[PDB]
């Protein structure tokens, strides 16, 4: 068995902007799951944007992101959230959150060491 | 002293309602440390809150607040700020901002490793 992600929350936005992203767990315990989010801007690579231990308690960020993003948890509810402040065009992307058991301690930065992903939410920034 | 800190932001809420505090500084600012914040109420013991990073790419959480609060830094204001969600009459204490020079590792949870602090802002929480 796996873990189900479903991102949600994108669209278009304007410059400046405010947008909160969120993901839903299913199939399978998602305190069990320290979780990413990722972003692939359009011809680029997938990049790691930032991580949240299994209980909410450490959040680590990309230095593109740090300062404007905040990411959180509620296990209550199967959802991590990735709220995103400042946007600017740089920010469009398709982004993804992902899922992996904390037994290793790992680079979190490196979509390698992550073992189930979401379908991804596109957001558009103008 | 090298840094003074003064927060401010504290009042009297209902349970379930919000507030932001913030931390200002005089002397040198606050892009020169690592920043923690702790509460106490009294016949308590101090409490450890929120830990943020020198570079702000990390943050660290007590358990009796992950998920609710949220410590970040914007270091062109030179504020610290602490938004406390879904507060609890257990929240109710004198909360202070503290200052680290981030030269070493050390246990970023314990108050005895910081060097600097606030006078503190009463929250009360009904």
């Known amino acids: 068995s796996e873990v189900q992600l479903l991102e949600s929350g994108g669209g278009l936005v304007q410059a400046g902007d405010s947008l909160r992203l969120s993901c839903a767990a299913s199939?399978?315990?998602?305190?069990?799951?320290?979780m990413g989010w990722f972003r692939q801007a359009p011809g680029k690579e997938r990049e790691f944007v930032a991580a949240?231990?299994?209980?909410?308690?450490?959040?680590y960020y990309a230095d593109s992101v740090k300062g404007r993003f905040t990411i959180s948890r509620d296990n209550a509810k199967n959802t991590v959230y990735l709220q995103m402040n400042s946007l600017k065009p740089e920010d469009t992307a398709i982004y993804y959150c992902?899922?992996?058991?904390?037994?290793?301690?790992?680079?979190?930065?490196?979509?390698?060491?992550?073992?189930?992903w979401g379908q991804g939410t596109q957001v558009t920034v103008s | 002293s090298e840094v003074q800190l003064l927060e401010s932001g504290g009042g009297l809420v209902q349970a379930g309602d919000s507030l932001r505090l913030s931390c200002?500084?005089?002397?040198?600012?606050?892009?020169?440390?690592?920043?923690?914040?702790f509460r106490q109420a009294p016949g308590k013991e101090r409490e450890f809150?929120?830990?943020?990073?020198?570079?702000?790419?990390?943050?660290?959480?007590?358990d009796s607040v992950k998920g609710r609060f949220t410590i970040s830094r914007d270091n062109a204001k030179n504020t610290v700020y602490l938004q406390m969600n879904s507060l609890k009459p257990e929240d109710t204490a004198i909360?202070?901002?503290?200052?680290?020079?981030?030269?070493?590792?050390?246990?970023?949870?314990?108050?005895?490793?910081?060097?600097?602090?606030?006078?503190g802002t009463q929250v009360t929480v009904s």
């Open positions: 992902a899922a992996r058991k904390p037994m290793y301690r790992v680079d979190i930065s490196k979509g390698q060491n992550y073992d189930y």
């Open positions: 199939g399978r315990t998602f305190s069990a799951y320290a």
């Open positions: 949240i231990s299994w209980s909410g308690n450490s959040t």
